[PDB]
Structure 1
Amino acid sequence: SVVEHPEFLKAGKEPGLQIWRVEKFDLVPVPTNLYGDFFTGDAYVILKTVQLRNGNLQYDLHYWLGNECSQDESGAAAIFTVQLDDYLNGRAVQHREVQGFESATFLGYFKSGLKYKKGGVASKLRKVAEQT
């Protein structure tokens, strides 16, 4: 058995940059026009597909965590990454990217510079209060 998902069916099919945002426990595609605009309250999964001369495709998975993102989002970006790697027969290299501490490689995917925006989608984790 493997992991299936509509977005997984689209991942790494050709050279390019694919960006998904974690939205209420799901992997949601980011509009291509909005690439590089990251909500500091959210978590994302980026897949970078490069064409190798040998005809094979190289893969780099980066999960980006905003300073104000909730636990369900940062936890889910990490799991989805593992699952996307597995779906790609574990051929991907995984990178953890933290806001303001991103790697030079990742920063290079964005020619006009990556941009941070306040806000993001709400968490779906139900807050649990300690007994009064």
Structure 2
Amino acid sequence: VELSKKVTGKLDKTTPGIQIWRIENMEMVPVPTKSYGNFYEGDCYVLLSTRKTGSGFSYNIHYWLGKNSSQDEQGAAAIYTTQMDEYLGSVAVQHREVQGHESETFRAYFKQGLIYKQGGVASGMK
């Protein structure tokens, strides 16, 4: 929720890799490298890639839209990516992905295998 503060504060600094955000239960969440890879398929996942450069770092915010949530959810994953795009310094970029758009791009950042669990992780009841 509101990536700002617990995210825009220090999305990624001096560290080549990527930090995704799980949109399970229709809500953004900080997905570090401890869970990166196995992300629900029916949801949304913002992936912020950061690389080193001669001037500083190059960020690349992505917005994965595992076609399952609702149109508003698409506005959410995109909003968080829009909050870190400016809070990062405008040096980041914006990318579009989906359940069939993050093919070699998503796996590209993941040189191994991307798993996909079941969305709706806020059930724990039904």
Residue ranges of structure 1 left out of the alignment (5+ in a row) = 123-132
Query: What CA distance in whole angstroms lies between the structure 2 residues aligned with 1:63 and 1:4?
Result: 16
1:83–1:25 Cα change, 3 Å: farther
How many residues are paired up?
Answer: 120
Match of 1:46 in 2: 47
8 A Cα contact 1:42 1:121, kept in partner: no
Supply the RMSD in Å over aligned alpha carbons.
2.4
Structure number with higher strand proportion: 1
Larger radius of gyration between Structure 1 and Structure 2 = 1
Q: Distance in 1 between matches of 2:26 and 2:40?
A: 16
Contact kept in structure 1, 2:19 and 2:32, CA below 8 Å: no
Equivalent residue, structure 2, for 1:36:
37
Matched-pair identity in %: 56
For residues 69-107 of structure 1, give each alpha carbon's deviation from its aligned partner in whole angstroms, at most 9, with x where no partner exists: 223322111111111111112111100101122253332
In 2, are the aligned partners of 1:25 and 1:72 still within 8 Å (CA)? no
- Mapping 1:85-100, distance limit 5 Å: 85-100=85-100
What runs of 5+ residues in structure 2 fail to find an aligned partner?
none
SS of corresponding position for 1:36? coil
Q: Secondary structure of the equivalent of 2:58?
A: strand
Match of 1:19 in 2: 20
**TM-score (norm. length: structure 1):** 0.77
Task: Spell out structure 1 runs of 4+ moving beyond 3 A.
Answer: 23-27
Q: Give the Å deviation of 1:67.
A: 1.9
Q: Which amino acid aligns with 2:60?
A: D
